[PDB]
Amino acid sequence: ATVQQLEGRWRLVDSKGFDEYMKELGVGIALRKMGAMAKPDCIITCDGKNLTIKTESTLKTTQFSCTLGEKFEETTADGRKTQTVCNFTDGALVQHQEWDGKESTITRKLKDGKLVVECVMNNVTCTRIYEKVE
Ligand SMILES: O=C(O)[C@H]1CCCN1C(=O)Nc1cc(Cl)cc(Cl)c1-c1ccccc1
């Protein structure tokens, strides 16, 4: 398995736990409603150790870029400014966020042709499944 295998435009087809994850973060109701109802596309591109992940929907449209293994300032959709590191480890892209003494992890994996995105903060989890747009 390689990081290049995650490249492409992906469309959200299933979600579990995402509102609960947003509540654990303390995201306010206006943003939670947007997250519960949005069906974003995720667009992942890489070039060696360079990675970009873009999100698109009528309700919001964010993007970050990084070098694998390098700490960087990530502005999240909910407006945190985190210290983030992304690594491709044991067949998963792992995105580790730290801010204000807190931490959250997002993983992204290829399974049976689908992109599986899993989030966690303080044992509150989500699982989101995407299918390739081609
Ligand atoms: O990319 C994904 O499938 C999931 C995994 C975790 C972030 N994510 C989103 O879809 N993000 C989000 C998507 C929408 Cl429509 C709205 C918000 Cl507020 C977020 C968001 C971002 C950070 C933390 C909480 C909510």
Ligand 1 mutation target, pool 82, 117, 121, most atoms within 8 A of CB: 117
Radius of gyration of the chain (CA): 14
Q: Which amino acid type is present at position 75?
A: T
Q: Are the C-beta atoms of 43 and 57 separated by less than 8 Å?
A: no
Q: Whose CA is nearest to atom 5 of ligand 1?
A: 119
Domain extent, residue 109, equals: 1-134
Residue 35 CA, ligand 1 centroid: distance in Å:
6
Structure method? X-ray
Q: Is 101 exposed, middle or buried (0-12, 13-18, 19+ CB in 10 A)?
A: exposed
Question: How far does CA 10 lie from the centroid of its chain?
Answer: 12
The CB density around residue 13, as the number of other CB atoms within 10 Å, is: 12
Q: Are the C-beta atoms of 104 and 118 separated by less than 8 Å?
A: no
Longest dimension (CA), the chain: 41
Distance CA 75, CA 81 (A): 5
Residue 18 CA, ligand 1 centroid: distance in Å:
8
DSSP per-residue codes, 43-88: EEEEETTEEEEEEE-SS---EEEEETT--EEEE-TTS-EEEEEEEE
SS3 of the chain: helix, strand, coil, percent, to 5: 15, 55, 30
Looking at the structure of the chain, the number of domains it has is 1
Q: Are the C-beta atoms of 123 and 104 separated by less than 8 Å?
A: no
- In eight-state DSSP terms, residue 30 is H
